[PDB]
Design an enzyme around this catalytic site. Structure first.
Site, PDB file in Angstrom:
ATOM      1  N   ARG A 141       0.808  -1.214   0.000  1.00 24.41           N
ATOM      2  CA  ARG A 141       0.000   0.000   0.000  1.00 24.41           C
ATOM      3  C   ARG A 141       0.843   1.267   0.000  1.00 24.41           C
ATOM      4  O   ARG A 141       0.330   2.338  -0.338  1.00 24.41           O
ATOM      5  CB  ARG A 141      -0.933   0.008   1.212  1.00 24.41           C
ATOM      6  CG  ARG A 141      -2.035  -1.034   1.164  1.00 24.41           C
ATOM      7  CD  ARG A 141      -2.992  -0.864   2.329  1.00 24.41           C
ATOM      8  NE  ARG A 141      -3.894  -2.001   2.470  1.00 24.41           N
ATOM      9  CZ  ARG A 141      -3.581  -3.133   3.084  1.00 24.41           C
ATOM     10  NH1 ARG A 141      -2.391  -3.317   3.630  1.00 24.41           N
ATOM     11  NH2 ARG A 141      -4.486  -4.104   3.154  1.00 24.41           N
TER      12      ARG A 141
HETATM   13  N1  LIG Z   1      -7.693   5.799  -7.768  1.00 22.93           N
HETATM   14  C1  LIG Z   1      -6.421   5.421  -7.504  1.00 22.93           C
HETATM   15  N2  LIG Z   1      -5.384   5.914  -8.215  1.00 22.93           N
HETATM   16  C2  LIG Z   1      -4.115   5.546  -7.960  1.00 22.93           C
HETATM   17  N3  LIG Z   1      -3.769   4.674  -6.998  1.00 22.93           N
HETATM   18  C3  LIG Z   1      -4.709   4.101  -6.210  1.00 22.93           C
HETATM   19  C4  LIG Z   1      -6.118   4.453  -6.424  1.00 22.93           C
HETATM   20  N4  LIG Z   1      -6.830   3.757  -5.521  1.00 22.93           N
HETATM   21  C5  LIG Z   1      -5.953   3.023  -4.790  1.00 22.93           C
HETATM   22  N5  LIG Z   1      -4.689   3.229  -5.200  1.00 22.93           N
HETATM   23  C6  LIG Z   1      -3.478   2.594  -4.628  1.00 22.93           C
HETATM   24  O1  LIG Z   1      -3.845   1.535  -3.741  1.00 22.93           O
HETATM   25  C7  LIG Z   1      -3.003   1.557  -2.586  1.00 22.93           C
HETATM   26  C8  LIG Z   1      -3.758   1.127  -1.336  1.00 22.93           C
HETATM   27  O2  LIG Z   1      -5.166   1.125  -1.561  1.00 22.93           O
HETATM   28  P1  LIG Z   1      -6.158   1.143  -0.297  1.00 22.93           P
HETATM   29  O3  LIG Z   1      -6.967   2.415  -0.337  1.00 22.93           O
HETATM   30  O4  LIG Z   1      -5.350   0.791   0.924  1.00 22.93           O
HETATM   31  O5  LIG Z   1      -7.132  -0.098  -0.602  1.00 22.93           O
HETATM   32  P2  LIG Z   1      -7.650  -1.041   0.594  1.00 22.93           P
HETATM   33  O6  LIG Z   1      -7.998  -0.073   1.698  1.00 22.93           O
HETATM   34  O7  LIG Z   1      -8.835  -1.761   0.002  1.00 22.93           O
HETATM   35  O8  LIG Z   1      -6.469  -1.931   0.888  1.00 22.93           O
HETATM   36  C9  LIG Z   1      -2.490   2.979  -2.451  1.00 22.93           C
HETATM   37  O9  LIG Z   1      -1.094   2.980  -2.144  1.00 22.93           O
HETATM   38  C10 LIG Z   1      -2.725   3.620  -3.801  1.00 22.93           C
HETATM   39  O10 LIG Z   1      -1.471   3.915  -4.418  1.00 22.93           O
END
Ligand SMILES: Nc1ncnc2c1ncn2[C@@H]1O[C@H](COP(=O)(O)OP(=O)(O)O)[C@@H](O)[C@H]1O
Ligand SMILES: Nc1ncnc2c1ncn2[C@@H]1O[C@H](COP(=O)(O)OP(=O)(O)OP(=O)(O)O)[C@@H](O)[C@H]1O
Ligand SMILES: [Mg+2]
Ligand SMILES: [Mg+2]
Lengths: 478, 471, 55, 249, 119
Positions: free
Chosen positions: D113
């Site tokens: 992440r």
């Molecule tokens: N719309 C987006 N554009 C670019 N990167 C994204 C996007 N959505 C998520 N990411 C990437 O996903 C990674 C982690 O996502 P996260 O929000 O933690 O998903 P979850 O909470 O489901 O694990 C981040 O480091 C980010 O770089």
């Protein structure tokens, strides 16, 4: 004296233990200090175990428990018609108290083997596929099974609404749903006028586990009153899976050992007791009958699961709704291949029986030949008959929401389908053809409709054919 | 007035004995405040929640913090009420813990402020409202295929690293900007790094002025990790109960809430459920979700992220929450790796608001035709993968040609994605998105390169990108 | 032309036999998986029972 | 104000020891006989790693906990608990290990992440195309068993993926500087490696690393100082010069 | 002890190649079962052909096994094992039958067993 009173010595997770109550009966109702009801379940040597039927957060150690002297029972009577009520008989819609003057125990023996009679009366659900492929008779227990958002509730509501002019009383039991969803169901029933003969029993997800465990039994107890008065009753159970989950919760809180797949060992007995009380009474016991439509939710259509297998073993049949068919635009989503009713078929009317056989063959043939549609060929063996008639059958078996139709109109349209009168009509125009044909019938075929309604048989074939041709003359293809 | 005494310490489990006839009620809060009497003791400030009545003047409790340093015989003060948190306009812009104590170092709440109990019954049958209205979010996929309902409950499903947190942040930003309403964030099982990032991002964007935030990190005991959600819900309910507002409640992860409940049940010693969860999982889920409803005064709509362990949707935590959701959104790592954000699966997402009489006949037809084209394109891929696309019939080639562009146009650039990509975000009205998808379906953009549809806003920006690419 | 027809027929029968074999393997593997996981479920139940008894 | 790296070698063994102690103390068990507070234990341990602000000194501490799985079951209690806590996971598979792919990181299942923020600008530039190439290769590899007459783009993607897999391979106790990792990844992803056969990729990489020490030191210095990719013309010219003198088998 | 600095590169490469070939042969089982042997590429056919012989050559006759079977048994030095497996990997013994490699000592005994069978 400590014979008619007792003091709580233990509270936790909705289970209480009381000292005293020397004359309490097993399965009796008890009253707490703040007005919450309870059930005396275990009569141990020096204390009584009580299951709390309500909010247990207001009960402390040392408060008094009052004996009521009555085995657990629910109010019954015609005064319950048109009201939504909890499993204990307490109204939840306001509108003042329910002024009934009769009660019936929740746990009652089922009708004996000599008290029953063979099922012979049709139950019109108003759904083409149900009335055609899987007929249901009064007194039969038919299972409705499917995945999430497959239309089981819609089917139940349509069946309840279709009983408007039938001499049948409907009882709807909501177990574990959202209270807003129950409210919406009640609103739709009120709008369509089904509240004139319907009793609604509700137990929301926020309620304690014993209420969810007891709700269908309260529904059965309410239905049995009208059943033994000689009337016909319809009962719908919306989540036997949620009932099983609540009963497993209660059993685990009682520290009983788990059984197969973490469910209690008597999870089959739980459902057998409930579903065995629906029957068709013999003439010596009156003409009353009670029919049940339990609901079970599967995981990705896994029929071989434990609870679905138990309910299938208990019930007289099943109706399967498929998520792929539901998503593909076939909103009824009834799979005729796997759905079957075994007590039914004898109760189906002669006119409908005379066309159901051809309808089954056409739909089945389409159902093994749909996958070859990648390249239509082989002339009549695939194209002209199997691909065309089957597609038209799928088109006619579709039905709109909350619009049940009379069995006579169903017979007319399905006869028209089977006799090849729809071979020239394109698939996109079939539904409009049926809709206009219903109005043409209502305007010009009163004699045919009355003949069917009075004789339960098809009218003269030549007259029916000439009427169909006369209608087809005025239809325009677009 | 009487006090209790500590009898047993079993880690996060404490037994307290009171005087006969003065036992506290279940879910009451007990305060422990002890000063070190000598050099062999430490100062303790701890609170406990009543769980069970064991009999013989004994109470079984669960702790909301570390129990290290506790000594048998310590004095316990009964508050006579459940955990009460500060509520009102004071909570806006602040960050609270499970107990309602601010953790942003901006000052304490005045002691005379109104406080409401965490535990309360759900609204009754008579006082619920069942009108259905569409909540515009400005995200193309959400607005088209899985419309959100005002006052409803929305669940987001997916694995790790799919983008659920980013999607929640974008929803907060868009809805706060284009509606101005109050929002509450409850980070059940919040990671400290993610909470710090969220706080900094919201403070920089200015949305913090209208939001109240409750964290309850993972390093806190399971009792706190379980009660954070109820604290947030209690804070949210006030704005509709006393002001008639329409409020949004965001929950970081329901899976961690279920995990905390199972841990608390195991600590209390109840027999495990199907796969080790608590037997009271369904009742706890119902108690949490049933209070999120729409009434005459106002409504609370909730967006909840659901974690799915090892893609297994049959797991009890994902399974039991499905019955309470009006719309479901599924995120796919397969789509995420391809560069299509928000990576929402267009064929698995469902909503009860997608009806002709709710969203409109044009919207319903457009969404259904998009779904049909995508579904048809799904099967043809293997034939395309082995044999050339020339093997396909004439209509199949057009179906593929338009499905690629539809798939790429489903993607969108977020405002919160600035820190990741550097490209500014955009807000797309539902009328604009349905018009664009209708135009794509009818085929007025079949000549533009498919790469021009990626990470773009309105359909005009697609033409702008194509012109910048040299069309 | 006759050779082309023979080639198409051969591909037909080969693919049909391949699908039949793959479905047979699917059935066998699904049976094995279903038989395997119930043992783990019953072992979990046995562990729960033993833990409850030991207290 | 320092930076610390901490490696925990068996959180599974720590959990087993804690389970033993709890059962000897006769505390009630959970699933798999584990105590209810095992997740509390692991979260309390792991949350102490942090990046401090400038006001607190700017120090940092990073943790790399280890979890062992029995027969690759990642749905077990301890694996799920540790997975739900950490910011990312790296999956190693014996199927990849025995097939010659070592280190055996499974890029499909692995997640990070914090990715992007934890990379230099040049590495961010060069990793984006690599991710897409690997995703396409893993998507289309399911069709490799069906003959050889596949769509021209499909075998082109397969050829690119094979060379990518060969590039990602690494020896034991042979760390590679980032200024060379970025250059080799650029060479792989810009098509300069598409004519070298798959069997020669490792030797090509070794000879390129050797060549970059005698020539092209300016590119290495530029990367090491500005954290950005050098001028495109100079890097392409250096790659072409190396390819001219490279011998192919 | 299986490291290049302990057993040598000559040994290590042969061991790794044998492991890789056996892993590929293990992976090929499902596609062979559901598609037939003739549907494999000439690379995979050669992989199977070499891997079956390698797997059979891994077997050996033990001295203590003489009570079970009449074969006396043998003792094979590490150099002989490495050389034999390298020769098998090089394709020198592709023309010999599969079962000639079962329960023998050095690579020569495969040749004499094949000659006794009549090659
Ligand atoms: N719309 C987006 N554009 C670019 N990167 C994204 C996007 N959505 C998520 N990411 C990437 O996903 C990674 C982690 O996502 P996260 O929000 O933690 O998903 P979850 O909470 O489901 O694990 C981040 O480091 C980010 O770089
Ligand atoms: N014949 C139909 N025509 C149109 N819409 C339909 C039809 N049948 C069902 N629906 C719609 O499909 C959705 C299915 O909801 P419904 O409650 O009927 O399903 P269910 O299988 O009982 O699911 P749940 O688990 O959500 O209670 C609803 O939006 C309903 O209005
Ligand atoms: Mg329903
Ligand atoms: Mg997240």
């Amino acid at each position: 004296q400590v014979s008619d009173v007792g003091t709580v010595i233990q509270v936790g997770d909705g289970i209480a233990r009381a000292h005293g109550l020397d004359n309490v009966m097993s399965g009796e109702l008890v009253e707490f200090a703040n007005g919450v009801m309870g059930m005396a379940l275990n009569l141990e040597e020096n204390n009584v175990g009580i299951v709390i039927l309500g909010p247990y957060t207001g009960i402390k150690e040392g408060d008094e428990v009052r004996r009521t002297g009555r085995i657990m029972e629910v109010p019954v009577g015609e005064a319950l018609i048109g009201r939504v009520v909890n499993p204990l008989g307490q109204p939840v819609d306001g509108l003042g108290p329910v002024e009934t003057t009769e009660t019936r125990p929740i746990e009652s023996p089922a009708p004996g083997v000599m008290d029953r009679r063979s099922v012979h009366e049709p139950l019109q659900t108003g759904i083409k596929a149900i009335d055609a492929l899987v007929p249901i008779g009064r007194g039969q227990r038919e299972l409705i099974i499917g995945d999430r958002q497959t239309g089981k509730t819609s089917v139940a509501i349509d069946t309840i609404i279709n009983q408007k002019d039938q001499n049948m009383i409907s009882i709807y039991v909501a177990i574990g749903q959202k209270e807003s969803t129950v409210r919406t169901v009640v609103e739709t029933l009120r709008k369509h006028g089904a509240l004139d003969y319907t009793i609604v029993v509700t137990a929301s997800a926020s309620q304690p586990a014993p209420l969810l465990f007891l709700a269908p039994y309260a529904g059965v107890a309410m239905g049995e009153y009208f059943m033994y008065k000689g009337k016909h009753v319809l009962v719908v159970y919306d989540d036997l899976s949620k009932q099983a989950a609540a009963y497993r919760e209660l059993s685990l809180l009682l520290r009983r050992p788990p059984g197969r797949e973490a469910y209690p060992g008597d999870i089959f007995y739980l459902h057998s007791r409930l579903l065995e009380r629906a029957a068709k009474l013999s003439d010596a016991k009156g003409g009353g009958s009670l029919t049940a439509l339990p609901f079970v939710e599967t995981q990705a259509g896994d029929i071989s699961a434990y609870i679905p297998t138990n309910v299938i073993s208990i019930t007289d049949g099943q109706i399967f709704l498929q998520s792929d068919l539901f998503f593909s635009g076939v909103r009824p989503a009834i799979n005729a291949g796997l759905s079957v009713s075994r007590v039914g078929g004898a109760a189906q009317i002669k006119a409908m029986k005379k066309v159901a056989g051809t309808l089954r063959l056409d739909l089945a043939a389409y159902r093994e030949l749909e996958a070859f549609a990648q390249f239509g060929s082989d002339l009549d063996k695939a194209t002209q008959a199997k691909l065309a008639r089957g597609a038209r059958t799928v088109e006619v078996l579709k039905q709109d929401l909350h619009q049940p139709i009379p069995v006579e109109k169903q017979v007319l349209i399905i006869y028209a389908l089977t006799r090849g009168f729809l071979d020239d009509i394109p698939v996109e125009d079939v539904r409009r053809f049926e809709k206009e044909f219903y109005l043409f019938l209502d305007q010009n075929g009163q004699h045919l409709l009355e003949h069917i309604r009075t004789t339960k048989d098809l009218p003269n074939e030549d007259d029916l054919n000439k009427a169909i041709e006369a209608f087809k003359k005025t239809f325009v293809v677009s | 007035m009487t006090r209790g005494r500590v009898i047993q310490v079993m880690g996060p489990v404490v037994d307290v004995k009171f005087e006969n006839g003065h036992l506290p009620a279940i879910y009451n809060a007990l305060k422990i405040q002890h000063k070190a009497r000598n050099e062999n003791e430490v100062d303790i400030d701890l609170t406990l929640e009543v769980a069970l009545h064991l009999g013989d003047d004994t109470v079984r409790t669960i702790a909301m913090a570390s129990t290290d340093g506790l000594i048998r015989g310590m004095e316990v003060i009964d508050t006579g009420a459940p955990i009460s948190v500060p509520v009102g306009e004071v909570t806006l812009g602040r960050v609270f813990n499970v107990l309602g104590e601010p953790i942003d170092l901006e000052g304490d709440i005045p002691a005379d402020a109104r406080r409401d109990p965490i535990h309360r019954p759900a609204p009754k049958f008579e006082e619920l409202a069942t009108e259905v209205e569409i909540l515009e979010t400005g995200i193309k996929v959400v607005d088209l295929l899985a419309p959100y309902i005002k006052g409803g409950k929305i669940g987001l499903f997916g694995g790790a690293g799919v983008g659920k947190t980013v999607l929640i942040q974008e929803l907060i930003h868009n809805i706060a900007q284009e509606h101005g309403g109050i929002s509450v964030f409850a980070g059940v099982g919040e990671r400290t790094r993610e909470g710090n990032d969220l706080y900094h991002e919201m403070k920089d964007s200015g949305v913090i002025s209208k939001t109240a935030m409750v964290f309850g990190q993972m390093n806190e005991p399971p009792g706190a990790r379980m009660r954070v959600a109820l604290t947030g819900l209690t804070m949210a309910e006030y704005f509709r109960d006393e002001q008639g507002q329409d409020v949004l409640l965001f929950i970081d992860n329901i899976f961690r809430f279920t995990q905390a409940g199972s841990e608390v049940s195991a600590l209390l010693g109840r027999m495990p459920s199907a796969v080790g969860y608590q037997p009271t999982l369904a009742t706890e889920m119902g108690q949490l979700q049933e209070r999120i409803t729409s009434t005459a005064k106002g409504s609370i709509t909730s967006i909840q992220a659901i974690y799915v362990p090892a893609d297994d949707y049959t797991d009890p935590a994902p399974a039991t929450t499905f019955s309470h959701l009006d719309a479901t959104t599924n995120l796919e790592r397969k789509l995420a790796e391809m560069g299509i954000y928000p990576a929402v699966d267009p064929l698995a997402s469902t909503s009860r608001a997608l009806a002709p009489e709710i969203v409109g006949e044009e919207h319903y037809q457009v969404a259904r035709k998009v779904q049909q084209t995508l579904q048809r394109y799904k099967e043809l891929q293997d034939i395309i993968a082995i044999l050339g696309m020339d093997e396909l019939s004439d209509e199949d080639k057009l179906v593929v040609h338009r499905a690629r562009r539809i798939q790429f146009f489903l993607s969108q650039n977020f405002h919160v994605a600035e820190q990741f990509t550097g490209q500014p975000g955009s807000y797309v009205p539902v009328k604009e998105t349905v018009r664009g998808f209708k135009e794509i379906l009818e085929g007025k953009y079949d000549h533009l390169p498919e790469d021009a549809f990626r990470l773009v806003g309105r359909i005009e920006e697609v033409v702008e990108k194509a012109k910048a690419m040299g069309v | 032309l006759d050779a082309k027809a023979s080639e198409h027929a051969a591909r037909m029968t080969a693919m049909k036999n391949a699908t039949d074999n793959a479905n047979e393997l699917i059935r066998t593997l699904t049976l094995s998986y279903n038989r395997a996981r119930q043992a783990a479920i019953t072992q979990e139940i046995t562990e729960i029972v033993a833990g409850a008894n030991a207290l």
